[PDB]
Ligand binder design. Structure first.
Ligand code: HEM
Length: 137
């Protein structure tokens, strides 16, 4: 289930973090505008960039912590507040996060592994709700 899925992802994090981030950017190519130097590149070109894998890894490091600190897929209010207050996240709305979770859930469903997809959907939605309460537009 959800808790196990956290260990699963953490066990092979760089691969999972990149595969899922790439699924997100490929599902929604216009999200690349929030980042630097992503446009004009294929998955492999992205994966060989200096900072791409390292970035996706940090994102998923924190996501897994947030999911881990959650109860019944409900994230802590303080974890949401951190995501809202991050300088790197200042121009974002909750829509950006729900897109990431849509891509994440779809990735899980398409893969071999036995992810509790519905739980990640629920967590994604609960996180979006908490980001709103924390003041994100
Ligand atoms: C649960 C969801 C998310 C988590 C846990 C998360 C986490 C992070 C972390 C930890 C960093 C900084 C890494 C570092 O200091 O090197 C970061 C940076 C950043 N994030 Fe997120 N993020 C999330 C969602 C998103 C989404 C959906 C977007 C945009 C569509 C986004 C846009 C950015 C941007 C533009 C940066 C700065 C990249 C850079 O400075 O090189 N984040 N995020």
């Amino acid at each position: 289930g959800f808790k196990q899925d956290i260990a699963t992802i953490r066990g092979d994090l760089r691969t999972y973090a990149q595969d899922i981030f790439l699924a997100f950017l490929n599902k929604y190519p216009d999200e690349r505008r929030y980042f630097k130097n992503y446009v004009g590149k294929s998955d492999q070109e992205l994966k060989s960039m200096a900072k791409f894998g390292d970035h996706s890894e940090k994102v998923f490091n924190l996501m897994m912590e947030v999911a881990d600190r959650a109860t019944d897929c409900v994230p802590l209010a303080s974890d949401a507040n951190t995501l809202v207050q991050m300088k790197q996240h200042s121009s974002l709305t909750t829509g950006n996060f729900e897109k990431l979770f849509v891509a994440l859930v779809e990735y899980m469903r398409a893969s071999g592994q036995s992810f509790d997809s519905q739980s990640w959907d629920r967590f994604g939605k609960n996180l979006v709700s908490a980001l709103s309460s924390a003041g994100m537009k």
